[PDB]
Amino acid sequence: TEPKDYRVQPHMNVVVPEGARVEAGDKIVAAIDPEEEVIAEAEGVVHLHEPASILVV
Amino acid sequence: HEIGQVPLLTLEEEVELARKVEEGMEAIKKLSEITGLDPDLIREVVRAKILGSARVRHIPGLKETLDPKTVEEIDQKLKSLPKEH
């Protein structure tokens, strides 16, 4: 396994569950417009590791 | 003072909240495209749940509007869609 951290922009949004399955022909984080920012290269798991805030309910 | 109860939004929260609505507005069409029901109507029957715990007006516009047993049947058709719609 090989780690690699992508930086999610303010004007962006993720479409991945709490560490779920990720394919090679998939898009993880949606952007303002499709920039060469987030396209999946290889199989693995995306881990959320810095929310800007936390909601407790 | 009621007004001070609600707090300001982030340059990210503002954005993120807005993105839900535009899609919701599209979704509303997308539904009316499939159901064959009207955008103006779906938008009511959807609001008549998110707000309509009681919000379903006391008298339905003196029967201009319909708020009785009718609401569910619509949201019952919307619940009874195949998963992708």
- Which amino acid is located at A49 in the chain? H
Assign residue A28 a region (left: φ > 0; alpha: ψ between -120 and 50; beta: otherwise).
Answer: alpha
Q: Which residue, among B45, B49, B50, has the nearest Cα to B31 in the 3D structure?
A: B45
How far apart are alpha carbons B24 and A50 in whole angstroms?
28
How are beta strands A13-14 and A44-45 bridged, if at all?
Answer: unpaired
Half-sphere exposure (CA, 13 Å, Cβ side) for A16? Answer: 23
- The length of chain B in residues reads 85
Nearest to A13 among B10, B11, B19 (CB): B19
Contact check, Cβ <8 Å, B10/A11: no
| CA dihedral over B26, B31, B32, B33, signed as positive or negative | positive
Experimental method of this PDB entry: X-ray
